[PDB]
């Protein structure tokens, strides 16, 4: 894995074209995330 930018603990990807997209985030240390919930699902075919 890469390192975080100097003096930072993560990167935020802010959308600048698609006005409906929410942010995405990157961490460079696995210890900075804990998998709280496991969600089992299907995608639904639109009607």
């Amino acid at each position: 894995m890469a390192h975080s930018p100097p003096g930072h603990h993560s990167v935020t990807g802010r959308p600048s074209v698609n006005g409906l997209a929410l942010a995405e985030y990157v961490i460079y240390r696995g210890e900075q995330a804990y998998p709280e919930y496991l969600i089992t699902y299907q995608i639904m075919r639109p009607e």
Binding site: H9, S10, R14, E31, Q32, I39, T40, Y41, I43, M44
Partner: protein, 161 residues
């Protein structure tokens, strides 16, 4: 040391996790190529992931980050889709779960939009889709996503062109 506890659909905790999953679906610029064509999910099960050792690893790091950032961990709840979900829940996140070719460098990626993470359940770009039918838009096969507690600390803001 990981145990999985099923949440009842009557539990307020099930309901708040389901609402975050459903309400953060969006349309994708690939027309559904990677993740499939859908506006909502059928939630089959929500399980709490309990591992004392992995939780302590997380809270140790969280305290280190907080102390470097005026006692602010900047903790978020974010989605993660991966073909490695089984390894992650048993052994924790590590370098093997990184997206080497990601837009922001080789690290572990998380999304506010559940539908963004859904694009990675079967691999980068949806891979070849579900193992049974080779369908990235499979409506039959069961998928799994993680809803994760993530320490951001001081985050570098990248605007996306």
């Amino acid at each position: 040391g990981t145990i999985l506890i099923d949440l009842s659909p009557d539990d307020k905790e099930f309901q708040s996790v389901e609402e975050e999953m459903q309400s953060t679906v969006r349309e994708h610029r690939d027309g559904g190529h990677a993740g499939g064509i859908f506006n909502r999910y059928n939630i089959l099960k929500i399980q709490k992931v309990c591992n004392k050792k992995l939780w302590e690893r997380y809270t140790h790091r969280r305290k280190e980050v907080s102390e470097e950032n005026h006692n602010h961990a900047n903790e978020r709840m974010l989605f993660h889709g991966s073909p490695f979900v089984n390894a992650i829940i048993h052994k924790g996140f590590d370098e093997r779960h990184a997206y080497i070719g990601g837009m922001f460098g080789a690290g572990i990626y998380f999304a506010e939009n559940s539908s963004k993470s859904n694009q990675y359940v079967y691999g980068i770009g949806g891979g070849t889709g579900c193992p049974v039918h080779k369908d990235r838009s499979c409506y039959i096969c069961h998928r799994q996503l993680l809803f994760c507690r993530v320490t951001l600390g001081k985050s570098f803001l990248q605007f996306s062109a």
